[PDB]
């Protein structure tokens, strides 16, 4: 689901929609949400609503629009999961970072903006979140369960603003050697935080997922809100 009429244009003229949640009160910091491989779906709607309840405005851009505009896949359906994996396989990460940078610029100039923008990414979005953190166009970044962070360690010293990452300790995408590499690499830059949730799998924060772990999701989400709160005012 997207908000009708919202259009954001990227570096290369590509335009895309977004689900936008205006804040309860103005002004407010704006949070750009980088979605999972499944697109702007029920979990994204939930995430928008949550952040609005917590004193933010939120913008979730349609990152699949270069291939398939309005993608919103339900992870309960095998056919829709398969669609999502096909989209991820072909997904252009660099164009995703560009689209997110455009959404951040858009977020900054919303009429209720207090001038501060954050970025929260989930899964696909968590990997994009790290790449955006390295680019530095955003005030604070949060990434949940990003894949392949261990291959982006050269970018650790490029991060010049705070970034916080939540990772499952039983995430099959991040086995022990990868966790050790990420832990040691990210540890070199005190602007970064990486928290591991022992006993939690890849989609531990996604309500409805068989991976969901309430205690882990609760602690991660509490840390996220405390990390974003400094943007408020």
Swiss-Prot record:
Q: Using the chain's own numbering, where are the disulfide bonds? A: none
Offer an example of a GO molecular function term for this protein. Answer: carboxymethylenebutenolidase activity
- Catalytic activity as recorded in UniProt: 2-(5-oxo-2,5-dihydrofuran-2-ylidene)acetate + H2O = 4-oxohex-2-enedioate + H(+)
Annotated EC: 3.1.1.45
Enumerate the active-site residues.
Answer: 123, 171, 202
Gene3D superfamilies in alphabetical order: alpha/beta hydrolase
Superkingdom of the organism of origin: Bacteria
Keyword Hydrolase among record annotations: yes
Determine if Hydrolase is one of this entry's keywords: yes
What is an example of a Pfam family matching this protein? DLH
Going by the UniProt record, its keywords in alphabetical order are: Aromatic hydrocarbons catabolism, Hydrolase, Plasmid, Serine esterase
Against PANTHER family, the record matches this protein to: ALPHA_BETA-HYDROLASES SUPERFAMILY PROTEIN, CARBOXYMETHYLENEBUTENOLIDASE-RELATED
Give the UniProt family note.
Belongs to the dienelactone hydrolase family.
Oligomeric and partner information: Monomer.
What protein am I looking at? Carboxymethylenebutenolidase
Q: Read off the lineage from the record.
A: Bacteria, Pseudomonadati, Pseudomonadota, Gammaproteobacteria, Pseudomonadales
């Amino acid at each position: 689901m997207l908000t009708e009429g919202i259009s954001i244009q990227s570096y290369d003229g590509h335009t895309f929609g977004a689900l936008v949640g205006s804040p309860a009160k103005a002004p407010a910091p704006v949070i750009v949400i980088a979605h999972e491989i499944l697109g702007v779906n029920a979990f994204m709607r939930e995430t928008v609503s949550w952040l609005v309840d917590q004193g933010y405005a939120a913008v979730c851009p349609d990152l699949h629009a270069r291939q398939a505009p309005g993608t919103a896949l339900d992870p309960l359906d095998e056919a829709q999961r398969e669609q999502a994996y096909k989209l991820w396989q072909a997904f252009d990460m660099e164009a995703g970072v560009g689209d997110l940078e455009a959404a951040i610029r858009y977020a900054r100039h919303l009429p209720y903006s207090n001038g501060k923008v954050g970025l929260v990414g989930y899964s696909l979005g968590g990997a994009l979140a790290f790449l955006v953190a390295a680019k530095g166009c955003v005030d604070r970044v949060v990434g949940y369960c990003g894949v392949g962070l261990e291959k982006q360690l050269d970018k650790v010293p490029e991060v010049k603003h705070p970034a916080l990452f939540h990772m499952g300790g039983q995430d099959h995408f991040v086995p022990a050697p990868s966790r050790q590499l990420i832990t040691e690499g990210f540890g070199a830059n005190p602007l970064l935080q990486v928290h591991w949730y022992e006993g939690a799998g890849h989609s531990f924060a996604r309500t409805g997922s068989s991976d969901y772990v309430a205690s882990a999701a609760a602690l991660a989400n509490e840390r996220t809100l405390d990390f974003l709160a400094p943007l408020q005012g």
